[PDB]
Amino acid sequence: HGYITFPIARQRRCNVQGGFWWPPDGSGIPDPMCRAAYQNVYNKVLQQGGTIDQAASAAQYMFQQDNEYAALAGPNYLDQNHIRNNVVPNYLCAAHATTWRIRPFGDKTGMDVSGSWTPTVIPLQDNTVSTVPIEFEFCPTAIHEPSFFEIYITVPSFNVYTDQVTWQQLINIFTGPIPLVQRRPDSQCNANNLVYRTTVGIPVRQTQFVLYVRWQRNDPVGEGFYNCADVIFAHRLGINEEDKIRPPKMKCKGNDKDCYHYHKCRQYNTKDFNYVEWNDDYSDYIENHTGINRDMCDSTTKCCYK
């Protein structure tokens, strides 16, 4: 049992943020995607003749079990076609938990909805890097050995706003054991003294992407843990350094001066231009001249029935 702590797993972030214990309808959950995830399981149980308590119990079970996003593979856990077709065929972010009446693994299908899932923002040092190394931290709340990990990244055409995570949209970037090490005082994990920690080069994406992490136990039970992690790279602002022409080193003089550890925790207006007023009228232009409901003729054409 466990979950990704860095980058924080989707279901882990929803659990830690809370507000899901009361009210029972999930209206206290501040994140809209964690709220929509809760409310989808809640609403689904109600549709199937469940009571408010059975609906709230199934939705709360999905959030509470953030360390048990699991599926049993049996003794044939190394068979790729067995995992992709029988163990986790779909509902990848839920680890194929689709039965609210049967626990384990209940119904965690709320976690596979598409939309604006909050990501870990990784800033780029330079916008030209091909890969960014990240030190993955997997938090085991229960210690299980022997075990191995598989880390996947979504293909560049995956869209988190509209797409379900599928095996056909995932690229394997890691496979093998991850050594069990001592947590650092820094650790995002607080279950025991140990973590799974490793550097993985993450291929750069110009869009929000998903990192799929499978933690498989090498045993006849074949229990595997599957987690979705939402990530995004922040681009560095300014000119690309390689395009920047530098001035020659000069020394100048004249009576017109205009002619020549810790870190820090409207501006575009000039003496010859008012950006605030211009950008407000330009925002209005965007609204009325883009989309299926844009102004075409009504502000210029008058008609009557003859």
Choose among Zn ion, a copy of itself, none what residue 271 binds, the Cβ cut-off being 5 to 8 Å by kind.
a copy of itself
Q: What angle do CA 101, 107, 47 make, to 5 degrees?
A: 70
Give whichever of 117 and 226 is closer to Zn ion, judged by the CB atom.
226
Choose among a copy of itself, Zn ion, none what residue 258 binds, the Cβ cut-off being 5 to 8 Å by kind.
a copy of itself
255-284 binders of a copy of itself (CB under 8 A): 258-260, 267-273, 275, 278, 282
117-146 binders of Zn ion (CB under 5 A): 142
Q: Is the torsion defined by CA of 251, 254, 258, 264 positive or negative?
A: positive
64-93 binders of a copy of itself (CB under 8 A): none
Q: Cβ of residue 143: shortest distance to Zn ion, in angstroms?
A: 8
Contacts of 228 (CB under 8 A, 6+ apart): 9, 10, 11, 92, 93, 111, 165, 210, 211, 212
88-117 binders of a copy of itself (CB under 8 A): 113-116
Q: Give me the long-range contacts of 156-160 (CB less than 8 A, separation at least 24).
A: 156/205, 156/206, 156/207, 158/209, 158/210, 159/114, 159/207, 160/114, 160/115, 160/116, 160/117, 160/208, 160/209, 160/210, 160/230
Give whichever of 185 and 220 is closer to a copy of itself, judged by the CB atom.
185
Residue 137 found at the interface with a copy of itself (CB under 8 A): yes
Contacts of 12 (CB under 8 A, 6+ apart): 3, 4, 5, 66, 227
Lookup result for tokens 């209206």: 27
d(CA 3, CA 147): 14
Give whichever of 16 and 148 is closer to a copy of itself, judged by the CB atom.
16
Out of 299, 302, 303, 305, the only residue in the binding site for a copy of itself (CB under 8 A) is 299
Q: Cβ of residue 256: shortest distance to a copy of itself, in angstroms?
A: 10
Residue 96 found at the interface with Zn ion (CB under 5 A): no
Give whichever of 81 and 182 is closer to a copy of itself, judged by the CB atom.
182
Residues near Zn ion (CB under 5 A): 1, 142
